[PDB]
Write an enzyme that holds these catalytic residues in place. Structure first.
Site, PDB file in Angstrom:
ATOM      1  N   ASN A   1       2.904  12.361  -0.645  1.00 14.63           N
ATOM      2  CA  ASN A   1       3.417  11.357  -1.044  1.00 14.63           C
ATOM      3  C   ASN A   1       3.645  12.511  -2.963  1.00 14.63           C
ATOM      4  O   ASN A   1       4.848  11.904  -4.126  1.00 14.63           O
ATOM      5  CB  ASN A   1       2.543  11.018  -2.573  1.00 14.63           C
ATOM      6  CG  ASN A   1       2.164   9.700  -1.369  1.00 14.63           C
ATOM      7  OD1 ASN A   1       2.862   9.314  -0.136  1.00 14.63           O
ATOM      8  ND2 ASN A   1       1.043   9.877  -0.624  1.00 14.63           N
TER       9      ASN A   1
ATOM     10  N   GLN B   1       1.141  -1.286   0.124  1.00 11.28           N
ATOM     11  CA  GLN B   1       0.214  -0.065   0.265  1.00 11.28           C
ATOM     12  C   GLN B   1       0.615   1.614   0.428  1.00 11.28           C
ATOM     13  O   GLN B   1       0.015   1.902  -0.911  1.00 11.28           O
ATOM     14  CB  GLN B   1      -0.779   0.934   1.777  1.00 11.28           C
ATOM     15  CG  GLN B   1      -2.066   1.407   1.317  1.00 11.28           C
ATOM     16  CD  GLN B   1      -2.986   1.154   1.834  1.00 11.28           C
ATOM     17  OE1 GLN B   1      -3.816   0.458   2.657  1.00 11.28           O
ATOM     18  NE2 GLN B   1      -3.589   2.055   2.413  1.00 11.28           N
TER      19      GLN B   1
ATOM     20  N   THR C   1       2.974   3.331  12.843  1.00 10.22           N
ATOM     21  CA  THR C   1       1.292   3.072  12.875  1.00 10.22           C
ATOM     22  C   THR C   1       1.335   1.566  13.287  1.00 10.22           C
ATOM     23  O   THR C   1       0.195   1.060  14.370  1.00 10.22           O
ATOM     24  CB  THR C   1       1.217   2.751  11.320  1.00 10.22           C
ATOM     25  OG1 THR C   1       1.328   4.033  10.537  1.00 10.22           O
ATOM     26  CG2 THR C   1      -0.516   2.807  11.348  1.00 10.22           C
TER      27      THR C   1
ATOM     28  N   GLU D   1      -3.998  -8.033  -1.092  1.00  8.13           N
ATOM     29  CA  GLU D   1      -4.921  -7.256  -0.936  1.00  8.13           C
ATOM     30  C   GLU D   1      -5.955  -5.874  -1.701  1.00  8.13           C
ATOM     31  O   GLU D   1      -5.143  -5.627  -2.175  1.00  8.13           O
ATOM     32  CB  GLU D   1      -4.966  -5.973   0.152  1.00  8.13           C
ATOM     33  CG  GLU D   1      -6.329  -5.272   0.635  1.00  8.13           C
ATOM     34  CD  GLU D   1      -5.906  -3.826   1.684  1.00  8.13           C
ATOM     35  OE1 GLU D   1      -4.868  -3.676   2.393  1.00  8.13           O
ATOM     36  OE2 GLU D   1      -6.230  -3.396   2.510  1.00  8.13           O
TER      37      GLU D   1
ATOM     38  N   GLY E   1       3.513  -5.487   6.620  1.00  6.71           N
ATOM     39  CA  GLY E   1       4.054  -6.948   6.286  1.00  6.71           C
ATOM     40  C   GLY E   1       4.321  -7.859   4.669  1.00  6.71           C
ATOM     41  O   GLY E   1       5.556  -8.268   4.325  1.00  6.71           O
ATOM     42  N   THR E   2       3.380  -7.237   3.721  1.00  6.15           N
ATOM     43  CA  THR E   2       3.605  -7.668   2.277  1.00  6.15           C
ATOM     44  C   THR E   2       4.752  -6.453   0.955  1.00  6.15           C
ATOM     45  O   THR E   2       5.566  -7.194   0.499  1.00  6.15           O
ATOM     46  CB  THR E   2       1.983  -7.531   0.829  1.00  6.15           C
ATOM     47  OG1 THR E   2       2.443  -7.662  -0.201  1.00  6.15           O
ATOM     48  CG2 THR E   2       1.483  -5.976   1.396  1.00  6.15           C
TER      49      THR E   2
ATOM     50  N   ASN F   1       9.091   9.311   7.714  1.00  9.35           N
ATOM     51  CA  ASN F   1       7.897  10.154   7.670  1.00  9.35           C
ATOM     52  C   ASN F   1       8.351  11.860   8.911  1.00  9.35           C
ATOM     53  O   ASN F   1       7.343  12.663   7.995  1.00  9.35           O
ATOM     54  CB  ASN F   1       7.166   9.422   8.632  1.00  9.35           C
ATOM     55  CG  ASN F   1       6.259   8.510   7.255  1.00  9.35           C
ATOM     56  OD1 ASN F   1       6.291   8.670   6.024  1.00  9.35           O
ATOM     57  ND2 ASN F   1       5.574   7.534   7.486  1.00  9.35           N
TER      58      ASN F   1
ATOM     59  N   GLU G   1      24.953   6.344 -13.865  1.00  6.24           N
ATOM     60  CA  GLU G   1      25.882   6.806 -13.161  1.00  6.24           C
ATOM     61  C   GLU G   1      25.831   7.410 -11.436  1.00  6.24           C
ATOM     62  O   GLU G   1      26.142   8.422 -10.801  1.00  6.24           O
ATOM     63  CB  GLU G   1      26.339   8.004 -14.247  1.00  6.24           C
ATOM     64  CG  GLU G   1      27.127   8.342 -14.863  1.00  6.24           C
ATOM     65  CD  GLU G   1      28.054   8.043 -14.656  1.00  6.24           C
ATOM     66  OE1 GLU G   1      28.895   8.165 -13.572  1.00  6.24           O
ATOM     67  OE2 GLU G   1      28.967   8.229 -15.799  1.00  6.24           O
TER      68      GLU G   1
ATOM     69  N   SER H   1       7.327   0.016   1.189  1.00  6.06           N
ATOM     70  CA  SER H   1       7.355   0.347   2.508  1.00  6.06           C
ATOM     71  C   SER H   1       7.908  -0.707   3.312  1.00  6.06           C
ATOM     72  O   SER H   1       7.194  -1.815   3.823  1.00  6.06           O
ATOM     73  CB  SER H   1       5.943   0.884   3.178  1.00  6.06           C
ATOM     74  OG  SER H   1       5.562   2.296   2.730  1.00  6.06           O
TER      75      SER H   1
HETATM   76  N1  LIG Z   1       4.718   7.918   3.368  1.00  9.85           N
HETATM   77  C1  LIG Z   1       4.108   7.110   3.140  1.00  9.85           C
HETATM   78  N2  LIG Z   1       3.519   5.802   3.996  1.00  9.85           N
HETATM   79  C2  LIG Z   1       3.274   5.318   4.322  1.00  9.85           C
HETATM   80  C3  LIG Z   1       1.624   5.502   3.626  1.00  9.85           C
HETATM   81  N3  LIG Z   1       0.857   3.942   3.488  1.00  9.85           N
HETATM   82  C4  LIG Z   1       0.787   3.222   4.913  1.00  9.85           C
HETATM   83  N4  LIG Z   1       2.912   4.421   4.920  1.00  9.85           N
HETATM   84  C5  LIG Z   1       4.054   3.577   5.530  1.00  9.85           C
HETATM   85  O1  LIG Z   1       3.499   2.358   5.718  1.00  9.85           O
HETATM   86  C6  LIG Z   1       3.462   0.915   6.505  1.00  9.85           C
HETATM   87  C7  LIG Z   1       2.291   0.039   7.191  1.00  9.85           C
HETATM   88  O2  LIG Z   1       2.359  -0.496   5.406  1.00  9.85           O
HETATM   89  P1  LIG Z   1       1.230  -0.275   4.700  1.00  9.85           P
HETATM   90  O3  LIG Z   1       1.881   0.397   3.728  1.00  9.85           O
HETATM   91  O4  LIG Z   1       0.365   0.568   5.508  1.00  9.85           O
HETATM   92  O5  LIG Z   1       0.923  -2.043   4.302  1.00  9.85           O
HETATM   93  P2  LIG Z   1       1.177  -2.712   3.462  1.00  9.85           P
HETATM   94  O6  LIG Z   1       3.436  -1.854   3.514  1.00  9.85           O
HETATM   95  O7  LIG Z   1       1.230  -2.881   1.713  1.00  9.85           O
HETATM   96  O8  LIG Z   1       1.982  -3.848   4.379  1.00  9.85           O
HETATM   97  P3  LIG Z   1       0.047  -4.724   4.818  1.00  9.85           P
HETATM   98  O9  LIG Z   1       0.049  -3.704   5.526  1.00  9.85           O
HETATM   99  O10 LIG Z   1       0.558  -6.347   4.994  1.00  9.85           O
HETATM  100  O11 LIG Z   1      -0.781  -5.108   3.438  1.00  9.85           O
HETATM  101  C8  LIG Z   1       3.362   2.487   8.061  1.00  9.85           C
HETATM  102  O12 LIG Z   1       3.951   2.055   9.297  1.00  9.85           O
HETATM  103  C9  LIG Z   1       3.533   3.669   6.867  1.00  9.85           C
HETATM  104  O13 LIG Z   1       4.889   4.087   7.688  1.00  9.85           O
HETATM  105  C10 LIG Z   1       1.401   6.123   2.377  1.00  9.85           C
HETATM  106  O14 LIG Z   1       0.759   6.445   2.175  1.00  9.85           O
HETATM  107  N5  LIG Z   1       2.798   7.356   2.840  1.00  9.85           N
HETATM  108 MG   LIG Z   2      -1.839  -3.259   2.664  1.00  8.14          MG
END
Ligand SMILES: Nc1nc2c(ncn2[C@@H]2O[C@H](COP(=O)(O)OP(=O)(O)OP(=O)(O)O)[C@@H](O)[C@H]2O)c(=O)[nH]1
Ligand SMILES: [Mg+2]
Ligand SMILES: Nc1nc2c(ncn2[C@@H]2O[C@H](COP(=O)(O)OP(=O)(O)OP(=O)(O)O)[C@@H](O)[C@H]2O)c(=O)[nH]1
Ligand SMILES: Nc1nc2c(ncn2[C@@H]2O[C@H](COP(=O)(O)OP(=O)(O)O)[C@@H](O)[C@H]2O)c(=O)[nH]1
Ligand SMILES: Nc1nc2c(ncn2[C@@H]2O[C@H](COP(=O)(O)OP(=O)(O)O)[C@@H](O)[C@H]2O)c(=O)[nH]1
Ligand SMILES: [Mg+2]
Lengths: 430, 439, 52, 431, 430
Positions: free
Chosen positions: B228, B11, B179, B71, B144-145, B206, B254, B140
């Site tokens: 973003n 995500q 988070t 997801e 997890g994923t 962040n 480079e 990120s």
């Molecule tokens: N900069 C930024 N960080 C994000 C954003 N959305 C989620 N994160 C970061 O991602 C971390 C958790 O992972 P998520 O992106 O929410 O979800 P995921 O990486 O797909 O992993 P899953 O929850 O298992 O699906 C959070 O602690 C956030 O710091 C975003 O829109 N912008």
């Molecule tokens: Mg997710």
């Protein structure tokens, strides 16, 4: 995809369920006749989670209603939203458990479950990708606690990897309606900790106080108490049916809230809640919602959260808001109250944001917290049990239906074992 | 002639990707539907967009990207939006069950049924390209994923292609605000995979981006949409030399020849300037001298790391706008005279400067104000040892009593990989401390 | 809902300075140029090839 | 290519800088919006390339009341929005509050902004600092600012236009306490200090402009006129030009003795300014008239060390020289023995400007006089007397103590004033 | 920014507050419905000093109403401007104190004070940057003099660095409405001297004297006294709320008025005050204002200011006026009355100017004075107290509720200690 099914049993569970479906149908724009009357596309976007699709375009809930007498199930069908449920999903006996856990789990309940397991098996088989189960029942009744806990065991055997939710109403001493409450409540806890993945406890004592003071209405009834629980229940799965900045389904909640397998008893609460005469004096902002969220008087449990330490807590925000506000508020509360938060786990609060608030509200918050303060409830229930069992009072009913006093002693040891194991981490230090 | 392929997983990576693809379409004049506007269909003769897009043969253009997630909420949300007609329908891979912040779920159980489909898509995309430079991956770490699938892809892509350069724009957890609660666990596990399989990594926490919006842009209540947008400008600035004429061009290849002294040390943090709102943008000159001084200002670091706590190794800073080669040289020489900014002894010259002619673009209805000049900086410094050390401390507190472990063991994870992942972070610490020592 | 409109939101922004999600701060200037347009900077006058 | 940075700290500094900047904008022809309706301005303003200009000034305070006036008045467009530094809690006349409790949390940003301005500047002549001594934040932050600047920049000249308490007319009650500490702070950190107490200006207004109910707006205009006359040699052509550095060349005989008081003439209301020619000989004597001093001090009670006079207008150099001879021949005005030549003169061609709605009348000639004299010891003596009476039974001391100040700082400042007075007495004697 | 929360307790305190909030609302242009209707732009810039947030384009005061009996607040809620206050802030008991300091501070005060402390904590957490607290209460009563000072003690315990104001209406022997006044009066003074940062004593006798002689109105009632008190209270923070030539908040007053830590009892007064019939004959100028300001009969206490020497004095001028005139008038008064100003404090008068005049006047002045002449108020109270305490009269009521002779003896000792240490500086010279 990732849809869930609903099972309700007993009188208390049925009344909770009959109002929960009322709340959900309102959000998705479903009238009691099962016809969509909404206005936005997002309402119909994720209706597969809670509803089935039948010929002619009518939506029916995937819920199973169980009981051992037709008294309460005749009223729910004769009232509003009685045409929503499928008539063939109504399964019930003819005798009644008679507030006897042994009767509802050994003699009479075990006989009936052949039929109800078939419809549950059929419902969970026809779904695309099952996500989990959820149960609503009371631990102070015969059929609710007796058949309800047996149904969990057998479903667990067939679906080991799925997750289970239970919204349990445990009995408090201040509001007592049965004399054999400590017996069957203790027996229900034994099987509940073994199988249920997540358990949420509710108190009729705490619900009265919230309705007395926060809403400031003088004459509550069971109709209003069922509505308070219904709002929180839909809040947990809110992010599963609507888009949001941060997505977290039921499984994500389990991972981030349960440190150790046997410690999965939570307390829940809702915000905002304001009276009719004082609703125009409040301003809906994140800084003021978090104040009511962590208020010790707002929890739906008689346990005082300031009598222990929070192992972890979770908040589910709904509406339009900025993540900077949400993140900075959850940090401040942890720093200001470092004493009430256990210190060998850093930043033990998880926050999720959903983009669609509830009906008629700009913003709403659902709080689910795992705190060591929940031990007090089991201690006071066990105290009532040991005074009654030391004299073998009312025990000829249970011993007369195949179960012996060996199980009663064994169940008490496990329940006392849970409290001792649960309180260990309150005083544990790094 | 030259192409780069972008991979989005998780995500966090996808939502950042949405902001990036909004900017690229506007920078090239492509409407959201993929067709150029009817007024100037034949106007854009020069194929400067070939770096990111590909001509469909008749009319529209398709981005060179694939979207990955287990997801369905985030992916299907794009398919219902106004960008439904831009991407190819079958390069938006979607699953059914989320990883739920569990690294073992996204690397052993669910992640192995989707990596097969993605490599097929990447194979078809790469064959269309002929002058491929490298890969861009966004994910990120604290998810997890995001950490699971990203680890599986980079391991798989490392043997399927070999010498092709890979760039990872990851987002590590903030020092204090977070988070989730268990992300220190899978952050270390993610660090293991990208250490030997990623050529360049970028630190994009962040907290630092929050402060930039509050101070420079003057937004008291920022959200993920604002965050973003800033990151997208960094991506565009870095690759601006691949598609626009300039005085000093820089290729994707480079970077690692000029920013990576030793193979183990390839982590770096970014900086961008100027960031300013229209209300106070025209009060100051935005000269070359003052924009480059703000780049070294610790408050404008995109990662919560203090460069004053360590020595600099190399800085690749790219200028886009109407800068003059004489002007940058005077600005650079002034920096060396400053005493607070101290470089490592064995690096006498440590600046790789690029100049481009295309001024930065701003999305209409956005936050930033369009300006003639902008500079984007990628710096390799020894001060990054803090971000790994504090993650190490957080993991050691919870793992000392085996907290949350049973959720990982029951999903195909052996107990031992927690220990070996810990050692490699410890091994990485010794590399950073032994490389900045005086000789 | 009993929610406030723009005519009250601006008043509250001026009074207590509470903002919506991702809302800029408007200082209510008076512009000769168009803020949406214009490149907002000082450019040194660049001549043609002078070495010839 | 010569510039100068001005720092306004405290309510007095801000409310005098308002007048200074309106006068400068009117003199250079720039509208309050900053736009110029279609090179001398470069000393005070910096061009943004397309349209407006920005002053080389930064405003400081801990009370947001005065700053919010500027951000909402008619000058909201002129200033950069993040150099109007504002705090949240006022020092409330507590010197320790402005030096030890909340002064350490705002000074960092001020140094950052001053560094940013100085980097843009290329020919920085020096610093101008305006502050109210008898106040909490004025003496507090100003002390910290000078302490930081003296180590950050070093040899760059700093000029302090301080306003000491009047002998008998004052508002606060603990004001003598923190004037001494600020005196210690500024003694070794300010290269040139000017005394501009309030009571003397009240007398000048009543005597000349014939106004019986003056306010602070009238007073601040005179200080702005003095500043403009002082700095006009940096930005206008004249027969004899005097830089900022040719004040640390001509007026301070010894490093400690850098306090002086100023004067201005002519200052006549328009109803009677046109019945007299106001030739050069008349204005040069009004400047030396003891009743015309801008500080409540008697020049007849001491000798003179150095005297710098700035003529602006259509003056003729020989006319100034004859006035010098007349002043020297006068017997009441006596100079110290070891200073045979005691005047430094400057002539500028720009006539004084007039602000609409003011009380001054436009004239062809004007002289601003800065004098260093031994007579300035009496103000130090009288504030020493007031402090000694205050400190006898330790009144109001706990208020300063409970903020982090050590007990002995008062004694150290007392002995510092004693040493300064002894230095003046020893230098005033003959050989 | 630098905002203050208001607390009012007891009948007298509630009556004072009901008029003070009306005056503030009229000054800021707030209608009885709470919706802004001002004309000038300055009237809204600094409204957050006193008023909070609410949805609908309205504002709500940050005040807490507290009492042990619901009689007075049920009356003020139905009166004018009674719809502003939040019903959540109304806190009342059901028994009342009955003019018993022990009952309102030990038995019933501790039982109820939890809720008032919670709501005060809520307001203090909510406010941006607290400046201090201000209290209006009477020292001659049971619930007020006891529960208010208990609240003072707890608030000082929780916020040791903030400032605090109290406006005490101490009992006067000339006009006595209770036979047990000295006991609780001295008991409250003993607690207040240790905790309060700024206390301003008021006498009903002085108010009656003023309304009878200066205003020359036939039949004064509690309305006019409350109006005078409200105007005097608003004059203190007028310059904090509005711009002026010299701005001076609450902190600047303390450091300029209190020489030594335990000398913080002031007497206040207001000018100009004229009868209706003589309004058009008088000339409102600065010298007349300061003349009426220093007029002895204009003080709001029974203590004669010509029987002692002024330590420090502070005047807050309102309106547009020249600064030279104010300074020269202050100097003229201090020179012509050098006998009444203590010598070792040179220039012991402070001045402040605010350019926003009160609604109704073109010029107005609030005078606050720390004079060695306040001791006669304490001397007369102690004489009655010792006379009643020698025979142990009425002491069983207090001693039957957890109290004894020890704290009475301690308080009378502290009472005389303050008088002696406060009079010593009258005779102390340079
Ligand atoms: N900069 C930024 N960080 C994000 C954003 N959305 C989620 N994160 C970061 O991602 C971390 C958790 O992972 P998520 O992106 O929410 O979800 P995921 O990486 O797909 O992993 P899953 O929850 O298992 O699906 C959070 O602690 C956030 O710091 C975003 O829109 N912008
Ligand atoms: Mg997710
Ligand atoms: N000439 C002149 N002097 C002023 C003016 N305003 C204040 N002062 C002087 O300032 C002294 C008091 O200090 P202030 O400047 O008012 O307050 P401050 O220095 O900002 O310190 P704080 O009150 O704590 O903020 C008075 O004695 C005045 O002499 C003004 O407008 N003109
Ligand atoms: N919240 C709620 N609680 C109920 C309701 N009806 C009964 N209860 C509680 O449930 C307890 C008895 O449980 P019971 O209904 O007899 O369980 P059952 O016999 O298995 O159906 C009592 O203590 C009640 O307080 C209801 O409609 N709502
Ligand atoms: N100024 C003023 N004084 C009042 C008012 N009402 C009562 N009082 C005074 O308060 C005293 C009684 O105090 P009381 O209210 O019984 O104190 P409590 O028992 O703590 O509430 C009387 O002596 C009155 O003089 C009022 O409206 N205004
Ligand atoms: Mg001030």
């Amino acid at each position: 995809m990732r849809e869930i099914v609903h099972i309700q049993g007993g009188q208390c569970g049925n009344q909770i369920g009959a109002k929960f479906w009322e709340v959900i149908s309102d959000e998705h724009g479903i009238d009691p006749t099962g016809t969509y009357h909404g206005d936005s596309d997002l309402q119909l976007e994720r209706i597969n989670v809670y509803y089935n699709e039948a010929t002619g375009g009518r939506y029916v809930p995937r819920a199973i209603l169980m009981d051992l007498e037709p008294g309460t199930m005749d009223s729910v069908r004769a009232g509003p939203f009685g045409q929503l449920f499928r008539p063939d999903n109504f399964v019930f006996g003819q005798t009644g458990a008679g507030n006897n856990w042994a009767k509802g789990h050994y003699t009479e309940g075990a006989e009936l479950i052949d039929s109800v397991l078939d419809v549950v098996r059929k419902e969970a088989e026809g779904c695309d990708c099952l996500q989990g189960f959820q149960i609503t029942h009371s631990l102070g009744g015969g059929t609710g606690s007796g058949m309800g806990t047996l149904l969990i065991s057998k479903v667990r055997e067939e679906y080991p990897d799925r997750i289970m939710e239970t919204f349990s109403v445990v009995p408090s001493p201040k509001v007592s309606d049965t004399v054999v409450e400590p017996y069957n409540a203790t027996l229900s806890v034994h099987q509940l900790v073994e199988n249920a993945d997540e358990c949420m406890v509710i108190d009729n004592e705490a619900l009265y106080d919230i309705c007395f003071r926060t809403l400031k209405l003088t004459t509550p009834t069971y109709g209003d108490l069922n509505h308070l629980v219904s709002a929180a229940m839909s809040g947990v799965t809110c992010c599963l049916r609507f888009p949001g900045q941060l997505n977290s389904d039921l499984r994500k909640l389990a991972v981030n809230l349960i440190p150790f397998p046997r410690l999965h008893f939570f307390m829940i609460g809702f915000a905002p809640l304001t009276s009719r005469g004082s609703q125009q004096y409040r301003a809906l902002t994140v800084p003021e919602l978090t104040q009511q969220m962590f208020d010790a008087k707002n929890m739906m449990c008689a346990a005082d959260p300031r009598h222990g330490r929070y192992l972890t807590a979770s908040a589910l925000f709904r509406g339009r808001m900025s993540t900077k506000e949400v993140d900075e508020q959850m940090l401040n509360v942890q720093n200001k109250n470092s004493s009430y938060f256990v210190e060998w786990i850093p930043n033990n609060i998880k926050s999720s944001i959903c983009d669609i608030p509830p009906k008629g509200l700009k913003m709403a918050v659902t709080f689910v917290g795992n705190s060591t303060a929940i031990q007090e409830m089991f201690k006071r229930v066990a105290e009532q049990f040991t005074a009654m069992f030391r004299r073998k009072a009312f025990l000829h009913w249970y011993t007369g239906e195949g179960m012996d006093e060996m199980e009663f002693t064994e169940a008490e040891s496990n329940m006392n074992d849970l409290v001792s194991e649960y309180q260990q981490y309150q005083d544990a230090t790094a | 002639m030259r192409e780069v392929i972008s991979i989005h997983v998780g995500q966090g990576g996808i939502q950042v990707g949405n902001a990036c693809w909004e900017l690229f379409c506007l920078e090239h004049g492509i409407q959201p539907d993929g067709q150029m506007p009817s007024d100037r269909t034949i106007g854009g003769g020069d194929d400067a967009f070939n770096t990111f897009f590909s001509e469909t043969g008749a009319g529209k253009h398709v981005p060179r990207a694939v979207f990955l997630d287990l997801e369905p909420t985030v992916i299907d949300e794009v398919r219902t939006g106004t960008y439904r007609q831009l991407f190819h329908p079958e390069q938006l891979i979607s699953g059914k069950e989320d990883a739920a912040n569990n690294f073992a779920r996204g690397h052993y159980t669910i992640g192995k049924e989707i990596v097969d489909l993605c490599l097929d898509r990447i194979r078809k995309l790469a064959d269309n390209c002929t002058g491929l430079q490298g890969f861009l991956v966004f994910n990120s770490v604290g998810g997890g994923t995001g950490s699971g699938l990203g680890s599986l892809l980079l391991e798989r892509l490392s043997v399927d292609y070999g010498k092709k350069s890979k760039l990872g724009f990851t987002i590590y957890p903030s020092p204090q605000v977070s988070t989730a609660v268990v992300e220190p666990y899978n952050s270390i596990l993610s660090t293991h995979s990208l250490l030997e399989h990623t050529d360049v990594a970028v630190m994009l926490d962040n907290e630092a981006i929050y402060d930039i919006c509050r101070r420079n842009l003057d937004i008291e209540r920022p959200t993920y949409t604002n965050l973003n947008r800033l990151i997208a400008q960094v991506i565009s600035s870095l690759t601006a030399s691949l598609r626009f004429d300039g005085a000093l061009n820089v290729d994707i290849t480079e970077f690692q020849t000029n920013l990576v002294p030793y193979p183990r040390i390839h982590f770096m943090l970014s900086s961008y300037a100027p960031i300013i709102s229209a209300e106070k943008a025209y009060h100051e000159q935005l000269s070359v001298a003052e924009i480059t001084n703000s780049a070294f200002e610790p408050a404008n670091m995109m990662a919560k790391c203090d460069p004053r706590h360590g020595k600099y190794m190399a800085c690749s800073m790219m200028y886009r706008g109407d800068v003059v080669p004489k002007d940058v040289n005077a600005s650079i020489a002034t920096i060396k005279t400053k005493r607070t900014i101290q470089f490592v002894d064995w690096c006498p010259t440590g600046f790789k400067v690029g100049i481009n002619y295309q001024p930065p673009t701003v999305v209409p209805g956005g936050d930033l104000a369009k300006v003639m000049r902008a500079v984007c900086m990628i710096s390799n410094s020894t001060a990054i040892a803090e971000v790994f050390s504090r993650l190490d401390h957080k993991f050691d507190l919870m793992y000392a009593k085996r907290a949350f472990v049973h959720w990982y063991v029951g999903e195909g994870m052996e107990e031992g990989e927690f220990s070996e992942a810990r050692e490699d972070l410890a091994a990485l610490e010794k590399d950073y401390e032994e490389v900045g020592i005086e000789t | 809902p009993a929610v406030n409109d723009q005519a009250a939101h601006d008043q509250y922004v001026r009074s207590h300075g509470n903002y919506e999600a991702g809302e800029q701060k408007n200082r209510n200037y008076n512009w000769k140029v168009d803020p949406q347009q214009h490149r907002f900077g000082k450019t040194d006058k660049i001549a043609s090839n002078e070495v010839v």
